[PDB]
Amino acid sequence: TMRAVKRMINTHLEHKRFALINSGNTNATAGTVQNLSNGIIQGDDINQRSGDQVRIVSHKLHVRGTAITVSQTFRFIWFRDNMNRGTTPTVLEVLNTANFMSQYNPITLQQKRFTILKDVTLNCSLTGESIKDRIINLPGQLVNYNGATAVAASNGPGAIFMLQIGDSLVGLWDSSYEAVYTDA
Amino acid sequence: TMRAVKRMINTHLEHKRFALINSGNTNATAGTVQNLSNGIIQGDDINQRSGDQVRIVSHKLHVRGTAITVSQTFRFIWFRDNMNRGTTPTVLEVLNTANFMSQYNPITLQQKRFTILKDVTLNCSLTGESIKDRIINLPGQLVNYNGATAVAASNGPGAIFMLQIGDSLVGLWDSSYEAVYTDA
Amino acid sequence: TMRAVKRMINTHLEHKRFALINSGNTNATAGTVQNLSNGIIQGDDINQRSGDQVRIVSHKLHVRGTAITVSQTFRFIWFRDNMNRGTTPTVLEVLNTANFMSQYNPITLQQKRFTILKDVTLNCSLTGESIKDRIINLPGQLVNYNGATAVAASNGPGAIFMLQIGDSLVGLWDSSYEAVYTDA
Amino acid sequence: TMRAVKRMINTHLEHKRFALINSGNTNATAGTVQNLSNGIIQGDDINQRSGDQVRIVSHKLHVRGTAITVSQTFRFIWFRDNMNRGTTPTVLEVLNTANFMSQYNPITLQQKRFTILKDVTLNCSLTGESIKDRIINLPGQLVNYNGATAVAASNGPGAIFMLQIGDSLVGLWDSSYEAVYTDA
Amino acid sequence: TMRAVKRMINTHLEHKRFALINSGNTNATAGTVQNLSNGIIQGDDINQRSGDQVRIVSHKLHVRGTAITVSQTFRFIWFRDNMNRGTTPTVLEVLNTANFMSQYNPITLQQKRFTILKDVTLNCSLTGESIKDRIINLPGQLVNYNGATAVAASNGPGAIFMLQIGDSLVGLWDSSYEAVYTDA
Amino acid sequence: TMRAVKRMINTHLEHKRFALINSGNTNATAGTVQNLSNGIIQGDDINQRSGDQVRIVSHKLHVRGTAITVSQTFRFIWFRDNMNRGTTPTVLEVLNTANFMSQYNPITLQQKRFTILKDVTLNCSLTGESIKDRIINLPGQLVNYNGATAVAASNGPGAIFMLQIGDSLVGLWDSSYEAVYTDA
Amino acid sequence: TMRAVKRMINTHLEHKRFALINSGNTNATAGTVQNLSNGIIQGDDINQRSGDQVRIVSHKLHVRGTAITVSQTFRFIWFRDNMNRGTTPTVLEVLNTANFMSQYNPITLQQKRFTILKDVTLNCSLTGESIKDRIINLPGQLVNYNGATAVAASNGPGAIFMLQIGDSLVGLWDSSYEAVYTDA
Amino acid sequence: TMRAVKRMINTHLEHKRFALINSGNTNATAGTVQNLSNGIIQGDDINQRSGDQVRIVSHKLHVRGTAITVSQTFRFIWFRDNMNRGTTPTVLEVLNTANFMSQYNPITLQQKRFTILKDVTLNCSLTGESIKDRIINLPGQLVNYNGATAVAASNGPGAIFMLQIGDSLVGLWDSSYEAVYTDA
Amino acid sequence: TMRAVKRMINTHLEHKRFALINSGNTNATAGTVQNLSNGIIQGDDINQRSGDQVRIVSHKLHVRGTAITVSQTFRFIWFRDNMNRGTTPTVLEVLNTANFMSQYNPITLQQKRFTILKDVTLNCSLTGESIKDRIINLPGQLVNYNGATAVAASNGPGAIFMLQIGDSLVGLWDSSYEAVYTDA
Amino acid sequence: TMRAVKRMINTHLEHKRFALINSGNTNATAGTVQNLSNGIIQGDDINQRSGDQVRIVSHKLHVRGTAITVSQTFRFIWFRDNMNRGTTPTVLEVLNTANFMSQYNPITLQQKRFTILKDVTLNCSLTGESIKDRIINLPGQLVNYNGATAVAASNGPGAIFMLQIGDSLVGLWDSSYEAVYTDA
């Protein structure tokens, strides 16, 4: 009866929580990669961790894009880095070319360096809907860390990131993230 | 045969009703929390109660947002306060930070101070759809009161509220609420 | 399945509550009869009632006696008046003679005018334990009223009382009572 | 086989322990409320915690009362605050009136703000037994915290307290508490 | 057990990948036909092939249209050429007439020269949403080649193409394609 | 085994095809009725017929509307004339009144003169989406003819038509139709 | 049949006995720890042992307290030292603080250094019962020794002790102990 | 199904790790006792612990001996101290006499003060193999601590040690240790 | 019948082979990491590959150490890098410290960056056996590449390496490797 | 159920222990016979006995030989004397001739005077391994004694001995022995 047991277990483990907000960023045509699970540092508080492992039960991502000056596109790629050794992946590691219309890098998705969680494209128009947002909630996995503080070198296999790329540099995007995890 | 019995029971209890309307309010970037079930005061009429308990069979919420001057966002968070002791919760009790893009306060949602019923975001554009609305109908629960009148001190565990937060202070939002409850 | 049904029913009915305290009374050798359920008057609050009936789910009685000047006895008789027509029963109605060592009145207990809930005797000594108390919790019954206010004429069949009789007039006794009842 | 599994689980979790002693206090006729589980602060020691949750497997309370000058009563009410938001409850929240003979506050026990664990009354006589004590051991529950330090604002839903009220201000009472909890 | 076996087989074959991007093209009222699987040339790299056959496990197509000067329509027809002998099909081979509102050529779809994978129409408005895109993912088939290089003469039966036709010549469209295939 | 047999039968019958396009028409407030299956004339080619009967296996209709000068509505009613005797039905035969908001003619739909296949309404706005289209694919039926050429007198029971009615005379609509039929 | 066999076995082993009395001791506010099983030394008599092991079948403890000058408390903690290496445990090893109202030392009871057999508190009053006693009989266990004589260094794992702590230094306590053990 | 459950449990607990190296030590004819699990101190890192308990899933020991000047013997005794109270055991506690050829101390192994994990003897010859090593991997147990830092007083029941004794004082030995443990 | 099928499959795939020899290397006290599967470059020969994936059916490693000047130790650690992104791992990534007696790096083996295939230690003595060797044969896995040539940047997840570390810099070690793999 | 019973029995009997060490002895070409179980004399301590019988549960023997001046052989014969009448057997009683290469005495092994437990030969070389040792652990038997002290006349049937014979008189051998026995 493996379904039940898994809950008697989880009602004994504390479900710590971590929140993070990243507002008023500009659209990048070359893209940028943001850290989301790196903020969970070693400490004894509710949004911290013990050791170098944590289990995200569920995490939620909220992306918003606002068109300014011109009508543009905003792309948000939520992904898990399965073989991270203490860095923030670059855009050319995930994307074939540093373009918002590009497919994934064939070599890195063949060896499964990354696991694409969600790929969202928002088209903000200055003659229609100039503001668009989207919320995504997903079950989580194991996250390994290589350090105790909130630096790139602390990222480990299972690290959660978000790639942002567009076709303009003038529009603004906002984001928020939340992770519920056990730390037993 | 617990399904049947529950209806023979409910066809004997009077299903009292309460309506409330809250129009022409301005968008708040810091947010505000409105009372919805507090209006049900002690009396012997159809939209009143006897004692300090009532059972909401079903309640409906209607939110509308209108963009003025600028294109903006309107966020409506319908929630139940499970451990209310005679107050109107503040925005920082529900939200991590007083921002419309923010995730929930990790400490208060861990202990389940609140139960989020519905989280609706409406993006009103002055170049597209400047008026948006939304109706939500949900089964209810038990509502406890700590007083007989329509004051904050009368709110109790199970109290129903609505948090409104946006990114402008110039847009207008309207709301209406209805609750069908037994009072046996 | 009459056990279950009885609970689906009771989780729908509001369990109103009434508290009452009666401190610093003197021991009576002739006795006195105190009112306990009479305090529940018509109103729309948590310790009031609708109509002339209520159902006590459970009630608790707390009696305390303190010896002063001499060592004495305190007798507390908690009882239900099953055929009350708007009065406070007298001591000779319950007791055969107005004495603290007396048995019950044979005629009134034969026709079951009363139902003795609890008969407690406390012997307070000024050379031993001069202070004694006792708490008793019991399931309740139906209580009928003949009026809407807290007067003797409002007492009805099922009315709850307490008879106090001792062998001195100098000792002090305290009491408190609580009743949990439905009013559907 | 849910009985077994629950033990294979618990033989893997560390059973941390916390002790506390509160001696030579004076009887209060208005009462006082003492903190018992608040002492468990964030840290990495055996009587500390990680995060804002802990699970008390079992806790024990020891109360002692000594009569001085006069024969008096000592009341100890051990209770769990199920909807605590960062405070030390007051006496009028638990008791109907600030009296040692009083029943519970009808409104707060109807909504189950509190769960009374144990209600002990000790009558110390200066002509009999002037010293009385009592030990109570009970299974525990989940305790939520709202802070990391030992302040009232850190108390959360499941917080354990003790209310002391008497009929004199001259007698002395002592108390000790122990909690065994998991922190996985 | 033909389901299983098909996976033991595929976990032994290398899943090579090919990406391609085609940006800033102008809308054609006469239409144009673009090559998508022709880019997979003979070589020993991850986006190349051995022999003249490959098996596309899955391929994805991304089309975007932007209205410029006028509000217009963009039509994208993703199709497989089942009887290709070394050419890029013309528009009159797929469409009855060189018009964006036209049905398929009755003679060529009767003999099944082509297999229409997806037919997408995007209406870009300069007073509404001027930018629209669409992503389509589909299981693949066998692709035969007639040459080793990326020329039209190398296209073979199973060749994948995309027909673009609109009602203006001023709007811009972008596209990207990805194919995952075995080459055993 | 009537399912199978029906396919062994149909893989023996030639599935002839007919295409037709009708572009740049103006919106009519009184409406117009267009011919769709009348184009299939007697001949020995792929889009012709033998005899006066044909069986449409499936047909597809594509309607497009473009707002010009004013924001308007375009209504398209695809219908089968079951009792046609050699004419193009008028608008008052299908509609109760020659208005785009009107319900069907009660007398002709009671006797089932017509069978409404699809009723599509497109609202083109000059401040939003000014261009809208819609594709509908449906299984067909038997079509009888009363002549050999493409004239109204050749229409017979089962004839397929399209009624177009709007609230302006300035907007433009386009349409295309395709029919796959057997002619055994 | 493991129940029977265990008795055929024990009716073959000699049940040696040891008695000990410790009278007229004074109450200690810091406490003291007394030896109980240490008296069983190597020899060939009825209250001696062979080797460094013995099996206590059952042992009995008798504690008496007498109030002198003031009314006081006497605490007796009968315990087994499971990891003794040749010493008399100190009071701070068993108790958290050297106080008669204190809970057990959290660290030593977590690792199970000790096993509390019985914790008895006697309140002797000079106005009530000034003399109180208590007898406790319990099944025993294995006792290991590290020496042959009656010195602290001879105590081993399973050693039996008694901790005495009070709130006065003037009262007197007496004790007696008996152990029935096998020595096969 | 107790085998499975034990793994669903362990895939939720973080398996912290601790490494330690102790090189260039000289052979002791009287012997020395080294600490191995004492290094795991309270902290929130991967090689630290929370509370005073940990569960070693598996630990590995590596011993190396090098003969210098003369051919000699190196003895390594890996052992668990089951009744440790905050010390580093001495050699005479484990060995009968401080000699490398000696059997275990009869009194301490009878009461099971220690549990010998591994007893390895390496004979290094200067005319043969002068360098010898050995690796041993074993499942672990529960480890209790009495302090938070890396001092002898922090050692508790379950503490892991290594005794080194030889027949020369001139040879050199090296050692390394690793422990994988849960800390839930 | 998944056992059989797996062989019918493998008798169809060509089992390519790669050999490599690395002789006359000096012992390193800081260690070095050698490449073993990197030599398999893109080409169409028997010891080459197509694409960026290969499946090693079985590989064999041969290590030899020769003592020169002094008696020394040679350590060989054969390992698979599961999350390689185009580098040759360093010694501190695998080992806790750059010492031949050291345990593995706790952080990198917790996240399973590496999988230790074999850890061999050879003690070469100049007074005994100065030459020692060892052959190890093991089933293989999937190997991913990030490039087509024999450079560090071509290494991918599944890359096979060998770490060599000793206690002298004067001894010589030799090695050979062979891999049998499919490339379908 | 004779397996179980044998353990319920043995968990009641004290497992006394005896250790003995015999270092720095010279190799004998004529041989010598050493006493091992004779050391267990009558007394009441842990390494003594009661009566003239004991039951060895298990005993362990450790032999070491060191080559000096010349390379030599060391032979160790561990044996039980089943018919001992109060002596130390001579070498010619066990061996056919007083030579280290000799077979057993045919007459004494035919009547089973002795039971050979272990026959170990160690060849110590001064150009190879000059030091060799060996540990042997074996279940025991009944041992009878003929006296109370540690003299040869006290040896009885079941007496344990060790015969040492070599081919040189210059090498040194060491030995240690341990016996675990019951004495019920």
Ligand SMILES: [Ca+2]
């Ligand atoms: Ca952790």
Ligand SMILES: [Ca+2]
């Ligand atoms: Ca009510």
Ligand SMILES: [Ca+2]
């Ligand atoms: Ca009523």
Ligand SMILES: [Ca+2]
């Ligand atoms: Ca008295």
Ligand SMILES: [Ca+2]
């Ligand atoms: Ca910490």
Ligand SMILES: [Ca+2]
């Ligand atoms: Ca916790």
Ligand SMILES: [Ca+2]
């Ligand atoms: Ca191929």
Ligand SMILES: [Ca+2]
């Ligand atoms: Ca617009």
Ligand SMILES: [Ca+2]
């Ligand atoms: Ca026909």
Ligand SMILES: [Ca+2]
């Ligand atoms: Ca014994």
Ligand SMILES: [Ca+2]
């Ligand atoms: Ca721990």
Ligand SMILES: [Ca+2]
């Ligand atoms: Ca040699």
Ligand SMILES: [Ca+2]
């Ligand atoms: Ca090639």
Ligand SMILES: [Ca+2]
């Ligand atoms: Ca390949």
Ligand SMILES: [Ca+2]
């Ligand atoms: Ca003796």
Ligand SMILES: [Ca+2]
């Ligand atoms: Ca014996």
